[model samples]
Target: AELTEVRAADLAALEFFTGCRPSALEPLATQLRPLKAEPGQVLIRQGDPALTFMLIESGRVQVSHAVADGPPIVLDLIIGEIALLRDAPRTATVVAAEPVIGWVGDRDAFDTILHLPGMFDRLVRIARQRLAAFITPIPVQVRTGEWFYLRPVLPGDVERTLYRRFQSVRKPTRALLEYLFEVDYADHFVWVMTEGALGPVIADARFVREGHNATMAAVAFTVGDDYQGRGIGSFLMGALIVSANYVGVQRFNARVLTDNMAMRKIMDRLGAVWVREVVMTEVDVPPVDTVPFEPELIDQIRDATRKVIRAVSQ
Candidate 1:
């Protein structure tokens, strides 16, 4: 109803676009449309295709997951950036808790903003910090007190370490690496056992959710030749179970080579119940032996998930 163009002062005031030259800002300033939302309006829903990025000038909103049960998270300021940048679905639902005033920029504007001076680098640094806070790395002690870490995978790990190591053995296509890095967390999630939180990856595991049954997922694991006997595979599996259950995967389907006793033993330790004469194993997360750890681990994951949702939106 008022001036159509966003004020340069207001745009520059936000940390995201502050590095943009005036020339770059001027075009974007005019393109941003004023955004308004009434109390109780749902601004974005989890799983929706990301269309626009929002910046709240006034009032607060509620952010939450549609599937993972928890109380709605309250926040003020930015929303919808991660999904846009990653080309992934919205990670959480956002609702206007009070009358909200903001500005909205569509995909093209978002792409332009990302290229403005230092914006992309700033995002990568912030993203890593956000991930590190939630992805608590567990220490693993091998013989003689030698240790390593089990943690969630990061986007950077694909190019920096995994690409070289996995390629040396598998001779994988660029397409495979691209698919792994572009995972939609809800459907396909991965974890790695590494020397440290940001250290070289020695092993990795993942679960891809079944299309017919979202609660069921096909699981896989791998460990470096030298690192196999130290139980890194089992540790990564345990983390995957916790994460799968967090994201609503209740059952896991995996096939093990008949002669691979080590892999079979890892599954057995996690109580992967025998499902068929074909020797396939199916696991229910928090199975009998692992129940003791679920209660506490679930709480940690819930807190971490909330923190990540807020951090990305901000």
Candidate 2:
């Protein structure tokens, strides 16, 4: 994958506002503040005050919400016109699901942009349409030869996923679910993907949910060392996003670990924004013995199952 080179002039041409209307977008571009994010960085979190409406001049971002027992659910790979728009709180946390560059502006700046006379109403209408689209349910069209399957997460899958997850660091004792719950999974769903007999087995994971009646999903994907660069992760992720959207899931979420430039570039291709960064801190511990099942885990599983509910809605 290659990095996208975006210029201010290119963004100025976006059809954010329909109809033939003069927009101050070209001049407003000069007021933009640019920033870059590395992978695995959290751009924003649920409940955070919505301050900025970002214009993704370049790169990609994952929009996701926290889940109860699993990982965060990614709703969409936001790009181009996606914004935090005025009067809306941060619906989900955003992260640099991959490396990205873009501009950020708060309410005041947005107001300034809108005050450019004829541009205000057009911007408002565009924002409203975007919000409506976020809530609209769509149909899923699974790609040829693509299908989804679910099963109890086997111990081997968990072990392999965790081992790969920790290969860059020291091992931890608690299970992935345990660690995720300790941080924040009460509002998330997690999953693994398998690709035929070649077994890039645990191809992906997601964190998704609905809050304030708005639906969203977020995700992360990993292919085994032997399968890296094969495009399996991209295929699985694309299928997952389409499936989620087909069922009325509106928003999508994702958090890509920083340093995974290729992953970030792939996400950028899907259209995402660079929102914020979060520091993930974990504790070191010896392995824990298998423990009794808890009810919360059941709830987590239930949420995970509901990911398919969107399919029915479609």
TM-score of each: 0.53, 0.33
Instruction: Write candidate 2's Cα lDDT for 1-314 as tens digits.
Output: 01112334444555543342334354455555666778877666667665565756456677776768999777652222222332334556777766776666654455455465555445534433433333222121123445433221222234223222223222323332232222222233334455442243445554344432235544555656754665555554544443344334545555656677656765665556644573111111111121122444333333444433321111
Off by over 4 Å in 1: 1-51, 54-79, 83-104, 108-126, 142-145, 159-183, 255-314
Output the number of the TM-score-best candidate: 1
Question: By lDDT, who's the top model here?
Answer: 1
**Total clashing residue pairs per candidate?**
0, 53
| Candidate 2 Cα deviation (angstroms), residue 2 | 31
lDDT of each: 0.64, 0.44
Candidate 1, lDDT over the whole model = 0.64
lDDT of 1 by residue, 6-65 (tens): 465567766666665554577677768778899999888887888887877778887766
